[PDB]
Amino acid sequence: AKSKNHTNHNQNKKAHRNIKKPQRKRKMSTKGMCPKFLRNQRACKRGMM
Amino acid sequence: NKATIEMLKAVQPFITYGYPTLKTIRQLIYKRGYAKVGKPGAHSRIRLQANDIVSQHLGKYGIHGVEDLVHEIYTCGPYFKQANNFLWPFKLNSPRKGFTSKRHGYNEPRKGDWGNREEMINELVQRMI
Amino acid sequence: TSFGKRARTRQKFSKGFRRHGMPAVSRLLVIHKKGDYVDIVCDPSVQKGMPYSYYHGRTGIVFNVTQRAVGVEVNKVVGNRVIKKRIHVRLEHVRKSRCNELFLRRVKENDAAHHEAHLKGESIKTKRQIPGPKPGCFVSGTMEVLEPAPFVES
Amino acid sequence: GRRPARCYRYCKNKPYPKSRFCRGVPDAKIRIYDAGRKRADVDEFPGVAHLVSDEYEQISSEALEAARVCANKYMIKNCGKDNFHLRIRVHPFHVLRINKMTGMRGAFGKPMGLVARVDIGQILMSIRTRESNVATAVTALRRAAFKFPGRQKVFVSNKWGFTKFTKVEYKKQAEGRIVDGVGAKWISTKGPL
Amino acid sequence: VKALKNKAYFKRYQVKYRRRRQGKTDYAARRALVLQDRNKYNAHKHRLVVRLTNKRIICQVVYSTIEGDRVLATAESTELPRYGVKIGLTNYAAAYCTGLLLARRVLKQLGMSETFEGVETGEEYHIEENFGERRPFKVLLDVGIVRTTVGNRVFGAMKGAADGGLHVPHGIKKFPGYSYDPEAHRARILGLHVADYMRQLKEEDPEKYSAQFSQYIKNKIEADDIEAMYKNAHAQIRKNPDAVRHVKLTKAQRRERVQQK
Amino acid sequence: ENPMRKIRIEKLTLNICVGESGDRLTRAARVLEQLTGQRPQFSKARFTIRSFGIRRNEKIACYVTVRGKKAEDILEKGLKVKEYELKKKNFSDSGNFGFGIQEHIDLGIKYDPSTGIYGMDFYVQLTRPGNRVAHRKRARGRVGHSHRVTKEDSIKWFQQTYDGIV
RNA sequence: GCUGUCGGUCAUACUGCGUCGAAUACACCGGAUCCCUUCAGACCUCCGAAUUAAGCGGCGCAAGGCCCGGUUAGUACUUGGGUGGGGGACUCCCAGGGAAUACCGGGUGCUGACAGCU
RNA sequence: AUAGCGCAGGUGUCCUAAGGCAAGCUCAAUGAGAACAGAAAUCUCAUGUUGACCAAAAGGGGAAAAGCUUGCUUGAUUUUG
RNA sequence: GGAUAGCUGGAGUUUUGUUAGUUUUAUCAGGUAAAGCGAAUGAUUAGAGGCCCUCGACCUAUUCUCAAACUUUAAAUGGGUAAGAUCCAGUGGUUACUUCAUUGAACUGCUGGGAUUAAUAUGACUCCAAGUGGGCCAUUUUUG
C-alpha cells in the first residue's frame, strides 16, 4: 500500500539545526602526496639533526 | 552603507524605517534608553539614570555624558558602531492612534505601513513613545 | 534516474561555440605552487583525468603537484557538515583562480603604507570604505518639463 | 466522438509537437490557410483589419477551419471573390493527448489531435482589402469570432497591407526605396554595387 | 545548384589558429615538446629548432614563455663564408657545420667552453661521460614539419650538436649507413658524396658540370679540394664565437569614392 | 612573368576498368606495363551495386600515372588515333581535358592470343608552373584565380599544340 | 617603414574578387649520382643557382562574414509583499533586479623574443 | 540533489585488433569531365568546419586526428597502497 | 518490521579578537524564464524573381507560425572561493628530490613590518542514550 517514494522536505531545516565547518590547521596534511616528494622530506628532516 | 541598504531590501515588508530627527533621538534615549553591560555571554540591560554608566564603558571614545551619545548618533561620528551597540534596542509600546494596514506599503494609495518613510517615521515613533 | 560519471553533462561538458579543438600551448605553460587557489573547470576536449561533474566550477587549494596533474583540496557539504575532499586532476582542467588577487595587491600597498610612517607614529588604520551616502552640492543646467503619457494602442 | 473543447481550453502542458518521439500522427483540418485573391500586389489593397485575442488559450484546428470558411463566405456574397485577401496566421503545432477506456497505470495517452496556442495580443486572422471595403471586412471578423472560444477584439490597424510600413510612411513609394506581392521590400544603401 | 559557401556557412566556420592556416606549426607535436611536468615547476625545457629553407639553414635554441618563445642563440649557414666554407650552404655538410657552430656559442654564453670539448668523425656517441661533476646541457630536437626520413639534413645538424657537447637524446636509426656503418656517415659530413658526384659527372659531361656547380667554378674549388674545406672549417669554428606603400582610407574618404562610381 | 606563365602538361593518367578479378584483370595490367614501362596499381570496389554485378572490395580495375618527357610521346601517339579532334564537352571546367579510345591493339604493341582486346580512358591535366603550392607539405595554399587554368584557356592551347579542332 | 625563424591572442586576424610591392629574404624554379620515396623525382628526399605569374605582404570593394556601440527597452521575463482586481484564464500596484533578435553609427587588428634590410 | 507502473530508447556483449605507438593521408557530399558505362562501378581536377567515421543505445569529444591505410609489437604485464 | 545516519536529551571537558541559512567589495561557474528562425538542426504557410507552352524542377532574395528530448544569444532568484596574528617581506641552512647550474621546490633558524587590515551582529569538541523511520496542508515552480 504505497506510500511515498522520496522527499527532501525538512532536510535543510534538519541540517542547519546543528552545518559544521572543519577547524583550520597549520601545516597541511600530506596524505595523497607524491611518494618521491615525501621521501625527500624525510631525508631533508634527517639532515638537520 | 551600500551594504546595509541591500540588507533592508530583503526585509522590507516586516519593517518600517526612515530618517530620525534630534527631537525623536532625545526622546528615545531619555524615556526608553537602556544600556547593555557585561562580558560576552551575559549582558544585563541597565536603565540610563546617570552618566557614570556611560562614562566607564564609552570613556575611551570621548562620550562621557548621555548628551554626547545624542551627538554621536545624530551626526554619525567615527564612534557610531561603539555607541549604538552600547544601547540595548528600544522597546516601544503600540502607537496611540493605530497603524493603517500592515499588509501594504507606506507608498501605494491604500496608505499602508511597511517600507521606508523618508521623514514621516518621526510622526509615528513620537506616538509609540 | 540513471547515474554515470557523466550523466546530464550535455550542456555542461559541451566545448562551446566555435571553441572546438585542443587546448592552446600558453594555457599549458601555467605553474601551480602548492598552497594556491584554482578553479576546476573541466573541458571535454581532453578525456584524460577530467574531474567528476560536481567539482566542475569549484575553487580550491592546491595541495600536491604530480608531474602531469594537480592535487586540489575542495570542500563539499553533505547535509550536516562540510568535508574537505582531495581530488587529483589533469593540468588542462585546472584554471588559475583570480579570487585572491585584490587581497594580494592590497597587502603590498597596505604593508608598505604602515611601514613608511615609522617616527610619525603610524596609527593609519588602513581600511576600505563602502560607498554609502553622498554629500550635497548645487547643480544647474538645461531643463525639460515632462508630463505623464496618454495611452496609445498600436 | 471527440471531446468537448472545454477540456482543452488552457495551456496546462508543455508544447508536444509532431516529431520522431510523438509518432502517432493525427492530421489537421486546416491545410488551406490563405483565402480570397492570394496573388494581388501591394499597391492594391491598402486597408486592413486584424482579429486579435486578449486571452491566453488553446484553439483547436477545426475551430480555425470553421472560422475561415465562415469569414470568406461572408466576403463572397458582399464584396465579391476578388476584392479581398484573408490569411489565417495561427498554426496548430501542439499535439493533444487522450487516455480512453487499472484506472490509471496506463494513464499516459495516445495523440488525439492538433491544437494551436495563442498569447495575449496575438494576431489570429488578418483581412487585407481595399479602403472602399474595411467596414464590411470588420463584420466578417465579428462573425468569425463566434467560432473561437473566449473573446477577440477586432482591430483596424494603420498599416499598408501586410507590411511593417504605416500608410503614411508608405506613400513617401515615389522616391523608390520600396519595390513584391504581400511584401514591400526595402532597398538598402547596403551593397554591393 | 545550391553552390559553394553560403552566408550561413561563414557564421558556423571556426578558424584554425594561424600557423596551421599559414602552414608552419604542428600544434600536436608542440604540446608534447613544451610540457615539462609540474614537479619541475619553473624549469625551462630547451629545444633545438632546425629549419631547412632554400639557400640557407637556420638553427636556434629556444625555450617557451607565456608572452612568447625566446631565443637563446641563433646560427645560420650564411655565416660560414667567415669560417672558410664559401659555397654549398644548403647541403648535409653545411648542416653539420651549422649545428656545431651553434653548440659552441650556447656553451660560451653560459661560460662552459673548457668543459665539454666533445668528440671530433662520424663515429657513434652519447654523453654518459663526465662523472662526479656538472651534467651536460640538455636540449631536444624539433624538426617542425620536415618529413622524417633516413638521412635528411636535420639529423646532420643533430650530430653537429652532439659533437659540440649538447646533450641531445637520439637513437642511431635515422642516420645514413644502416645494422650500422659509421664510415658512410663520415662521407656525408666531409662532403665526399658531393665531390664523388663531380668526379663522376665531369668525365661524363662538360655541359652538366658547367650548368650545376657554376659557383664552384667561380670560387675555383675542385673535386679533390672539398674534403680539405669542411675538415679545416671545424678548427676554424672551435676558436670562434659570433660577432656583428598604400595606407587605409577613412569613411569620409570612402563615401567620396561611391559618387565617383 | 610572361615566359613562366606558359601552359604545360601537368600529368597524364590512364585507366582500364574491367568486369572481374582474375586472369581477366592481370592480363590487362600487363598491357599498361609494356606500353608505359611501369607496373599499375589496382583499384577496388567501394560498395556493392549488383545490377552490373560487383560487391565490396573485389579488386575491379587498374590505373597508372605518367609524367614528363615520356608523357608527351604517349599523348601525341594517343591523339593520332583520334586524328587530332575532340569535342566541346571533353574540356572540363578546371581546364584538365580528356578523351576515350578503343583498341590498344591499334596503339602500338600487338594483338596477341592471351593479351586480348580492351579499351582505356586517356585523361590529361594542364596547369602552369607554381602548382607545387597546393600539394606541398609545408606552407600550403590555393593557386589564385589569375594564374589558374580555365576551359577556354585550354582550348587555345590545344589549337596551337598538336593542331587540334574542338 | 619593412623580410625571415620560433611564437602569443586565435576571424578587428576568415573567405571571395581586383590592382600594387624599393632592398635583403621567403618562393617558384633546374637535376636524379649517392642518402631516401612511390604506379609516378608530382609529393617526399638528396645535390643545386640558368621570374615576381602565383604563394607571401599592402590596399581597395555603397562586398559577405566577423567584432564593437546605439536603438529595440525600463518592453519581454523575474525576486519579495498584497483580506489587490478577475467566475476562471490571467493581470495590476508597492520594494527591487533586468535581457535577446530585427534595423542604421564606426571598425577590419594588436604583439613578445632573435637575426638581418634605406 | 530530486519522485511516479512518467516520456523516448539501451545492457548480461563484441574484438590479437576494433589493444598500443609512430608515420603518411583525408572524410561524407556537391560541381565539371573520361572508350564500352547509364540515376549507381573506376579514374581526374575543383570545392569541401566535419554535414562521414570511431563494434553497439543516446549524448559529449575529435581534421597534418581520436578518422582511413601501412610498419613494428603485446602496458589487455608485475608489486601492493 | 529492523539495522544505519540525521533530528533530541543528558554527562564531562576544551575555551573567548571566533563564529554566521546576511549583505558589500573583487572573482568565477551555470544554459532555466524570455528571445531566435531575412543563424545551424527539425516542423511549416504564401507567393515573388530565375519545335508552342505547361504546372514543375531546383536555385536567388523575401514571407506566415513553431519546438520537453533544437539553438547563435541570454536574464532575475540561487551556488563556489577570498577579504591577514593559522600574515607579509628580507636572509642563512638542511635535501637520495629537481635543475645545465645555491637554479628551484618544500620544510625549517634568525631579523625586521603589522594588533582585529569591508558592513552588521555575536563567546566558540568527546562520550552515552531515547523517541522516530504511515505523514498531511498552503503560496509560487511542476509531471500524469
Type of residue at F104 = H
Nearest nucleotide to the CA of E144, by C1', is G6
* Residue F93 distance to chain E (closest CA, Å): 15
The Cα–Cα gap between F8 and E251 comes to 46
**Cβ distance D167 to D160 under 8 Å?**
yes
Type of residue at B111 = K
Cell of E242: 659570433
List alpha helices for chain D, DSSP H: 61-79, 135-144, 167-171
E69 three-class SS: strand
Element (H, E) at B115: strand B115-116
Cell of E45: 625545457
Side-chain half-sphere exposure of E158, counting CA atoms within 13 A: 23
Measured CA distances, E126 to D173, D174, E148 (Å): 87, 88, 21
Strand order in the sheet with E56-64: E69-76, E56-64, E47-53, E140-142
DSSP B28-42: HHHHS-EE--SSSS-
The single residue listed with the C-alpha cell 675542385 is: E222
Strand order in the sheet with F61-66: F41-43, F61-66, F8-17, F119-127, F98-102
Q: Is C127 left (phi over 0), alpha (psi -120 to 50) or beta?
A: beta
Query: Residue A34 burial by CB count (10 A; 0-12/13-18/19+): exposed, middle or buried?
Result: middle
Q: Which one of C28, C30, C67 has the shortest CB-CB distance to E31?
A: C28
Protein-proximal positions, strand H, CB < 7 A:
1-9, 23-25, 28, 30-50, 59-66
Q: Is C67 left (phi over 0), alpha (psi -120 to 50) or beta?
A: alpha
D145 three-class SS: helix
The Cα–Cα gap between F30 and F38 comes to 10
- Which of E27, E38, E66 is most worth mutating to test chain C (most C CB atoms within 10 A of its CB)? E38
Which residues 6+ apart lie within 8 Å of C141 measured at CB?
none
D47 three-class SS: strand
Which residues 6+ apart lie within 8 Å of A38 measured at CB?
A30
> Does the CA dihedral C116-C117-C123-C124 come out positive or negative?
negative
CA E247 – C1' G20 distance (Å)?
12
The single residue listed with the C-alpha cell 551575559 is: B42
The Cα–Cα gap between E76 and E87 comes to 13
Cβ count near E116 (within 10 Å):
20
Which residues 6+ apart lie within 8 Å of E255 measured at CB?
none
Which residues 6+ apart lie within 8 Å of F109 measured at CB?
F31, F34, F35, F115
CA D108 – C1' H4 distance (Å)?
12
Interchain contact B94–C (C-beta under 8 A): no
Side-chain half-sphere exposure of F83, counting CA atoms within 13 A: 0
The Cα–Cα gap between B53 and E190 comes to 104
Q: Which chain E positions have a beta carbon within 8 Å of F137's beta carbon?
A: 145, 147
Among candidate residues B77, B69, B40, B74, the one with its CA nearest the CA of residue B53: B69
Strand H contact with E82 (CB < 7 A): no
**Cβ distance D62 to D107 under 8 Å?**
no
